[PDB]
Amino acid sequence: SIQAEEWYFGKITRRESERLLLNAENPRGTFLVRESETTKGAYCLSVSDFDNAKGLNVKHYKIRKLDSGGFYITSRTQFNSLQQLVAYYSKHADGLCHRLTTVCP
Template sequence: MGLPIYHGPISKQRCEELLGMKGKDGSYLIRDSETIQGALCLCVYKQKVVYTYRILQTHTGNYTLQTSTGTKEMYFKTLQELIRHYKKRNQGLASRLRYSVKRKNIESEPDVSHDAHDYENVESSDYVVVLPD
């Protein structure tokens, strides 16, 4: 995924650190869900709290934010469309999306096609195992 705001499989804690460093209401990023495989999370910062909204992809490839019962679901063809929509005021989020938190090195996206056992013999002090909450 080539979106600069997509941070991949970072932990909820790391997400909160990144948004907290930005420190502005309306700061946001997208990360992988830790609980539902294949789902994404839109994380939004407001008044030192990070609000997490689950992004689901339909069988037709459209994206939607998981909503509470009784709220009309909206579908978007791309994540860019979803982001554009939620940058508008009064769309039901804790804060409208205002400040994107981008990854530092976009061109070196991790190759997620390998299983964890492919990395057992890697000798790197930069490798950190992150366990789910």
């Protein structure tokens, strides 16, 4: 049940996920998955990053759901569950700003 997943944060707002991730305590790659407020039916992967110019910043990647079942962020690979997606990007960035290292506290 994804409601009980560590990394899943439900209907928190875009602003609240940024408030949770932009924090000195979080590694580059701290992340969370939530519902998109702007696109019903889509999810969103928010990831903390750090670039020298802007400091700590958050990038948000939409996650679309295939009507047939899976989930995707790019045309390179698709996944049968959000857990599977979270695991692939924990191993390879594959276009994301950073590999998912840490689940947002």
